[PDB]
Subunit: 257 residues, 5 copies
């Protein structure tokens, strides 16, 4: 067996290597579905990376080939510790009284990861089809009313980091034969975040037939989104806060027909 370890940093909207890395810009809200254009930096996008596995040289001297098979993984949200910070420029519990701790991060949690032998296959689906996404984002333009629910025509693949809006794409259950994905959403803008972390939990990646994801072209595809909640400033402006995710994937060389 071979083990790989990798991380994905969150893509909440603000640029890397600058003071708000890990956050979105402050969120603005439209008055109407017909005048809805979320500016670049104000919404989270999916993280993804392709890991290069050791090259498996193919002979074609036999009727079978070798592929790396992902048999199990561990994954952890990292930096959960930082959410014990209730002093950094936060709206206070008694804000009208300039007293108490910061309220910290609260609101919606969206945590999903995927491990596969090819890019994650996506279904386009949006809350408001008339939202105009910015040029920086990868979306289906003029998607139509059908995109507010399931439309079999509206497909994509997660081929780039930090550009596919979380609010416009999710895993396609009609595909992803060669990917395992897991997700949880808890909504509501005052909801406390609930996160666990341990190095003792393994997730088996074998399907009903005892086969894990098979890494096409010796590539292992990792994808995630880890929205922890909102940061609220003293002036009540709110931004997404994300955390990075750790992956440990155990692979074996498998003979494939």
């Amino acid at each position: 067996i071979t083990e790989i370890e990798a991380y994905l940093n969150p893509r909440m909207g603000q640029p890397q290597n600058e003071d708000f890395y890990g956050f979105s810009d402050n969120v603005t809200v439209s008055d109407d579905f017909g005048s809805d254009a979320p500016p670049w930096k104000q919404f989270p996008c999916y993280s993804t990376a392709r890991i290069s596995l050791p090259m498996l040289n193919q002979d074609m001297t036999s009727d079978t080939i070798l592929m790396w098979e992902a048999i199990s993984c561990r994954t952890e949200v990292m930096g959960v510790n930082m959410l014990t910070n209730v002093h950094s420029a936060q709206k206070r519990v008694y804000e009208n009284d300039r007293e108490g701790t910061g309220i910290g991060v609260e609101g919606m949690g969206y945590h999903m990861f995927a491990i596969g032998g090819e890019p994650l296959e996506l279904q386009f689906m949006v809350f408001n089809h008339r939202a105009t996404y910015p040029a920086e984002a990868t979306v289906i333009k003029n998607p139509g009313a059908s995109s507010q629910v399931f439309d079999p025509n509206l497909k994509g693949t997660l081929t780039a980091d930090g550009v596919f809006p979380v609010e416009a794409w999710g895993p396609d259950p009609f595909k992803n034969e060669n990917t395992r994905y897991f997700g949880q959403y808890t909504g509501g803008t005052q909801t406390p975040p609930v996160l666990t972390f341990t190095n003792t939990q393994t997730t088996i990646l074998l399907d009903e037939n005892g086969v894990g994801p098979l890494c096409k072209g010796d590539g292992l595809f990792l994808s995630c989104a880890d929205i922890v909640g909102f940061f609220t400033q003293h002036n009540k402006k709110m931004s997404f806060r994300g955390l990075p995710r750790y992956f440990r994937v155990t692979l074996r060389k498998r003979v494939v027909k």
Copy 2:
């Protein structure tokens, strides 16, 4: 072994191919049980479809027949990702300051799916028996006070998509020998929605005797309702929001004695 995949779009009330597909119209509330007539489009209805399976028999009456048996399934709520949208015309967290994110979708969750070899068998039951349903809806009319609890006379079958009100019909536990149904309700109007999604979870459909639903007339019947919660506008008008559901059903040919 044959596998089928299918979806059911939600039927929250607003019409298909129009700007509010996936939503109800804005909910209005009566003053009294005696003057309660929820307009068409303001309430959700059940989704359903019959999937045509490969024809097995020249004649459904034969001494012994082959039937498709649903032995297991996977089902997923799709589009959970869209609920990360807190910018689209939503009442804001600090609406008095015109500040903060949108409050997003909050309130009641009603999630139920059924997989069977015939239409889902329903029990009529309502909160207020004096509610007058619109002509578009399939209901028992003049159901009586009995209909606010269990009345063995008040039966139906889910034979049409988008017209059986969720608030008037539920699965009948006295029937559905040939259907498996699963339902979860969390109430409220500011409750956080909690949704999971994975392609790794299988539900076995075999009963206590090791037999799955048997598809009468080579039809597989899928039914659901997936109310995720309410959308609240700046003017405090509220509408149901629903999500579509994915089904994967594994079937095998079974020898059945008639």
Copy 3:
């Protein structure tokens, strides 16, 4: 081996075959424990029925059951005469049913055995109800003298009686309570879940006199009118019980 199916309708307080069947009357609240008299119709009572089994030493043994709360679908109604989310602004959905959930069922070969226990011993219950009169301060906790049996539908107040753990050798009972008044109701329903009724010795309830005894209470929460008057709302319960003839 025989299967019976049965239902119990809730007994929340309002009479059958009238417009508020499934609800209590609007709840009134006393000023003091010493002037506390909950009027008839304003509080829930236990539901119970005896199912006659085929006449049969042989006894019917209940080996398993399924039970479901029916009509959960109705709680998606947020239009019927409900206080609104933004009631000041005359806007939003109704708040729907919210608050305490009390869900308990029992399956036995004899009437459910009860312990009398009340929040306030000085409450005067109405003539329609079955209670212990002048029960005394000891009734606010456990008093081994204060016993009863669930012998009638719709008259034993839920707030005055619960299952007696010192008895019920021949009954299985199961209960869950979540309190509050704004609590979100949580309910599940499936036809796929079986509860085994066999005890540690591999024996189910044995039906004395060829009678199967079903009992429940299913308070789902409160209905709140525009004028803020609040009433209990209940739901009916389905039972499927599997029985076998047993040599005793």
Copy 4:
């Protein structure tokens, strides 16, 4: 095999056989930690009893002795039914409009039980070391700042009913090798109580070596605290409400190395 059944009534503060049995007196709150003196009756204490088991004759020349071994138990909180009362002199949901139900019992839940062959071994630990407990209570006087966290010298044993304050003593995990204890705390003052009751649940008391509590002196020791939450009067005064606990314990005679 021998079965014993017992109950412990709660010790929330107000005296037995008087109108507020099961409640505390109304809770007062100190202005600062230095001048903190919780009056007797305003706070709950642990319940405990020793059950006398049938006398076992000892062979005083034998390297083995006979002891009762507790192999399993059932325990139930009794009186959960009473919490459906929202009419008895409660602050109302809409107290401003003099309307709605009572708010009922809400706030913190503290549920713990212990079953052992000797008294429950306690660790003294308090929120505020400078609290002066009343003479009726059993505490460590002038315990010092270390008593706000763990201090190995602040030990006791639960040897009396209704006098060891819950807020000053908990089970000692460094001892209790001959006791099994289980506890759950949910805090808050508006939290809904969550309670279950069934006669079908057994807790095995055997340890990693297949040995249950061994009853020293043929005594079985039962302890609990069952704070269900607070009762709020119209005038906003708040008191603890407790419930009694049922125990069924299954014991066997065991020959033990001596």
Copy 5:
């Protein structure tokens, strides 16, 4: 087997000698990320200890095969009389609100110091000289930066909000953590002497105690304490460890 029983007291910020041992000092909040300096005593730090095991020295090492751990003093949270903001504070009535808000509960058992990853909410925070941090860590420290490492080598000085367990390392330590956030959240805590956690990895091997040292680490933030004047402080509880060890030929 040999059994070790040990405790770790919390390090919420107030020193061991002071009347508010178990608490932080009252929390101040900055106006901006660029003017953010949490004063010493206002934030929790990790607890840690090294237990000396019997000298064993074919080389033998102590192997931690299982543990039990319990949060102690849960009983104290039933106190709603000690100078607390009241439920009806404007009416000066009701119980104290008691402890509410975030719970951060993590423990680690290992054969060497817990390996840490530095990560902060706001990289421009200036931590006090008493605290062990990476100074001027830069914007990358708001998410994962593989260069920002440490080891938990001292009790009471590594801020919880600046360090977490490093999943890239800790081959010889088991760690477990649960976080629920908020400031009004109801605390939920359980305690029993009946639950065992197995410390063996996939290969049937527990942590191996290097230099015959067993390393215990934790943080147990139970929530916030709120004064009548609305000043808020962290409250923590101590943790019990029982570790079962066997001699292993390595």
